[PDB]
Amino acid sequence: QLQLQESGPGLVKPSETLSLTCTVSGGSISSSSYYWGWIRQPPGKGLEWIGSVYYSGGASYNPSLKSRATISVDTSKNQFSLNLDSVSAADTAIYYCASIAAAGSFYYYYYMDVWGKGSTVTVSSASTKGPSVFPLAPSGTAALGCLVKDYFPEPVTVSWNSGALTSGVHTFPAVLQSSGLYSLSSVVTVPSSSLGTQTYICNVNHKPSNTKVDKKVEPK
Amino acid sequence: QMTQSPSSLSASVGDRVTITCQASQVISNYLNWYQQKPGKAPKLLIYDTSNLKTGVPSRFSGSGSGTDFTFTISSLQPEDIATYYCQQYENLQFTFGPGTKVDIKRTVAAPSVFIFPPSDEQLKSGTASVVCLLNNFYPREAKVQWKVDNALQSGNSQESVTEQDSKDSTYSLSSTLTLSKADYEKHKVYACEVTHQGLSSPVTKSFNRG
């Protein structure tokens, strides 16, 4: 079915322009039955509409952002994009792709049919500090995990055994350390029967720093 | 200028729950509802005040008119832990309400407790992080006390709690004790003491360097 895919930086400096892109698949954007657009969610806040673009070249915007934002569309690429000028700390948010379905026939009847995944974007003067990842080893039922430490900003993904390991897995939300950097950890509950028999590898990613690591956790 | 009420609520599995929404103006166009799973993008469930998206479970329903609209889950499932949002299209703009958080109350459950040493790879950095894990318990509230050679710690530990589990409706808790390598090495016995409602007595996990 129709799907949206997020793309863009997780970090922009104050006063710069934030530029994000959606890729559309499972259908074409070249249709009068759809409008395409952007929504954001500052951490701890609700959703805010940014704007929308029509494949023929028209557009509409949230007045609070209209003076700063531009949304474009390209029907040969089957993509759409958002450019937000003069960014500040206020703009730290999770940005989402969305499609808008034109309901009925010839009326202003709309709903947001397909949503993106969310792209976390931080506005800051600081560098793209990547994480270091360390194993947490155990020594009935056992548990094991990975410690993800010292990074900024915080768009990170953690998975186990490349997605093979699901049940028993939990991750924790980012922790802000007094250092100004983030800490995060991930654990999995395993039987003592599999411990030391079955291997457990965490796969950790941080987009802005281009860091991709893999760590195997073994018992003592 | 939309608003929702309550800002949040808790209910048990199988309970019928209702949240409300007030439009910024009398609705002349569509009004819809979205579900935001913990950490995920919002997803449409209801459109034109009451129509379901294909694939949406029959337990979801919307209603109302004018400025006053509602959202109901006929029998709440643990998979329904989410924030629900009211949305309208008016004056050529899209507007969302604050959102209402819905989650699960359930009976007490005792935590499973584990303690982990820092890796050699971390000790090579000059720092040491000792980690205590509480897994699958209810209520969220828990007390963790770090001890090193029976010295109670403070001023050097962080804590973090998971989202409510989508199936079990339980929580897990991590606590990380941060020592310099020198502080880790000057001591022998490491321990994590846990106090929780589901326990008949506080419990302790521990390790020794060697």
- Do A86 and A145 belong together in one domain? no
Side-chain half-sphere CA neighbours of B196 within 13 A: 26
* Contact residues, A window 19-78, toward B, CB-based 8 Å cutoff: 39, 46-49, 52, 60, 62-63
Q: How far does B124 lie from chain A, in Å, by closest CA? A: 11
- Do A89 and A162 belong together in one domain? no
**CA–CA distance, B173 with A154 (Å, rounded to integer):** 20
Pairing verdict, β B17-22 and B68-73: antiparallel
List CB contacts (< 8 A) between B181 and chain A: none
* Peptide bond between residue A208 and the one before it cis (omega within 30 degrees of 0): no
> Which residues, in sequence order, are bridge partners of residue A134?
A147
Phi, psi of A46 (to 5 degrees): -85, -165
> CB-based contacts of A136: which residues, under 8 Å, 6+ apart?
A144, A145, A146, A147, A185, A187, A217, B116, B119, B131
- Do A115 and A137 belong together in one domain? no
Instruction: Tell me the domain boundaries of chain B.
Output: 3-104, 112-208
Of A48, A108, A138, the CB nearest to B116: A138
Q: How far does B143 lie from chain A, in Å, by closest CA? A: 17
List CB contacts (< 8 A) between B207 and chain A: 139
**CA–CA distance, A53 with A109 (Å, rounded to integer):** 16
CB atoms within 10 A of CB A97: 27
Judged by a CB distance cut-off of 8 A, whether residue A142 touches chain B is yes
**Last residue within a domain, chosen from A88, A123, A158:** A123
The SS3 call for residue B183 is helix
- Do A151 and A65 belong together in one domain? no
The SS3 call for residue B123 is helix
- Do A83 and A118 belong together in one domain? yes
Structure tokens at B183: 């502080």
**Last residue within a domain, chosen from A73, A96, A123:** A123
In chain A, what's the furthest Cα-to-Cα distance? 68
> Which residues, in sequence order, are bridge partners of residue A120?
A94
Q: How far does B142 lie from chain A, in Å, by closest CA? A: 16
> Which residues, in sequence order, are bridge partners of residue A104?
none
Q: How far does B94 lie from chain A, in Å, by closest CA? A: 6
Q: Are B48 and B32 in contact (CB under 8 A)?
A: yes
The SS3 call for residue B181 is helix
Of B41, B94, B165, the CB nearest to A115: B41
- Do A113 and A11 belong together in one domain? yes
**CA–CA distance, A203 with A188 (Å, rounded to integer):** 13
Structure tokens at A154: 């915080």
DSSP A132-179: EEEEE----EEEEEEEEEEEBS--EEEEEGGGTB-TTEEE---EE-TT
CB atoms within 10 A of CB A182: 21
**CA–CA distance, B205 with B115 (Å, rounded to integer):** 6
**CA–CA distance, A25 with A47 (Å, rounded to integer):** 24
* Peptide bond between residue A153 and the one before it cis (omega within 30 degrees of 0): yes
Question: What's the total number of domains in chain A?
Answer: 2
> Do residue A60 and residue B92 have CB atoms under 8 angstroms apart?
yes
Judged by a CB distance cut-off of 8 A, whether residue A112 touches chain B is yes
Structure tokens at A47: 């959703």
Question: Residue B29 has what DSSP assignment?
Answer: S
Angle at A200 between CA A197 and CA A202, to 5 degrees: 170
> Do residue B119 and residue A136 have CB atoms under 8 angstroms apart?
yes
**Last residue within a domain, chosen from A66, A101, A123:** A123
Element (H, E) at B199: none
Q: How far does B39 lie from chain A, in Å, by closest CA? A: 9
Question: Residue A104 has what DSSP assignment?
Answer: S
**CA–CA distance, B80 with A181 (Å, rounded to integer):** 33
Q: Look up the domain containing A55 and give its range.
A: 3-123
Q: Which fold has domain B3-104?
A: Immunoglobulin-like (2.60.40)
**CA–CA distance, A194 with A112 (Å, rounded to integer):** 45
> CB-based contacts of B43: which residues, under 8 Å, 6+ apart?
A115, B34, B35, B36, B37
Q: How far does B76 lie from chain A, in Å, by closest CA? A: 22
- Do A8 and A106 belong together in one domain? yes
Residue-level length of chain A: 220
What strand order describes the sheet that includes B151-152? B151-152, B143-148, B189-195, B203-208
- Do A180 and A143 belong together in one domain? yes
**CA–CA distance, A9 with A155 (Å, rounded to integer):** 10
**CA–CA distance, B170 with B38 (Å, rounded to integer):** 14
DSSP A30-94: --TTEEEEEEEE-TTS--EEEEEE-TTS-EEE-HHHHTTEEEEEETTTTEEEEEE-S--GGG-EE
**Where does residue A20 rank: exposed (0-12), middle (13-18), buried (19+ CB within 10 A)?**
buried
Q: Are B175 and B157 in contact (CB under 8 A)?
A: yes
List CB contacts (< 8 A) between A63 and chain B: 93
* Contact residues, A window 177-206, toward B, CB-based 8 Å cutoff: 177, 183-185, 187, 189
What strand order describes the sheet that includes B60-65? B3-5, B17-22, B68-73, B60-65
Resolution (A): 3.5
Structure tokens at B150: 């029976």
CA dihedral of B72, B74, B76, B81, whole degrees rounded to 10 = -30
- Do A137 and A104 belong together in one domain? no
CB atoms within 10 A of CB A82: 23
List CB contacts (< 8 A) between B41 and chain A: 96, 115-118
Write the single-letter amino acid at A216.
Answer: K
**CA–CA distance, A153 with A88 (Å, rounded to integer):** 15
Mutate to test the interface with A, among B94, B122, B154 (most CBs of A within 10 A): B94
In chain B, what's the furthest Cα-to-Cα distance? 73
Q: Are B113 and B192 in contact (CB under 8 A)?
A: yes
Phi, psi of A91 (to 5 degrees): -90, 0
What strand order describes the sheet that includes B112-116? B112-116, B127-137, B171-180, B157-161
- Do A141 and A109 belong together in one domain? no
Angle at B178 between CA B176 and CA B180, to 5 degrees: 155
Encode A127-160: b = buried (16+ Cβ within 10 Å), e = exposed.
ebbbbbbbbbbbeeebbbbbbbbbbbbbbbebbb
Token match 């009935």: residue?
A140
CATH number at A99 reads 2.60.40.10
> Which residues, in sequence order, are bridge partners of residue B116?
B131
**CA–CA distance, A28 with B31 (Å, rounded to integer):** 26
- Do A139 and A114 belong together in one domain? no
Judged by a CB distance cut-off of 8 A, whether residue A136 touches chain B is yes
**CA–CA distance, B43 with A1 (Å, rounded to integer):** 14
CB atoms within 10 A of CB A47: 26
Mutate to test the interface with B, among A41, A170, A176, A215 (most CBs of B within 10 A): A170
Phi-psi region of B142 (alpha: psi -120 to 50; beta: other; left: phi over 0): beta
Pairing verdict, β A11-12 and A119-123: parallel
- Do A171 and A201 belong together in one domain? yes
> Which residues, in sequence order, are bridge partners of residue A79?
A23, A74
CATH code assigned to B112-208: 2.60.40.10
Of A96, A109, A147, the CB nearest to B41: A96
Q: Which of B113, B21, B20, B39 is nearest to A156 (CA)?
A: B39
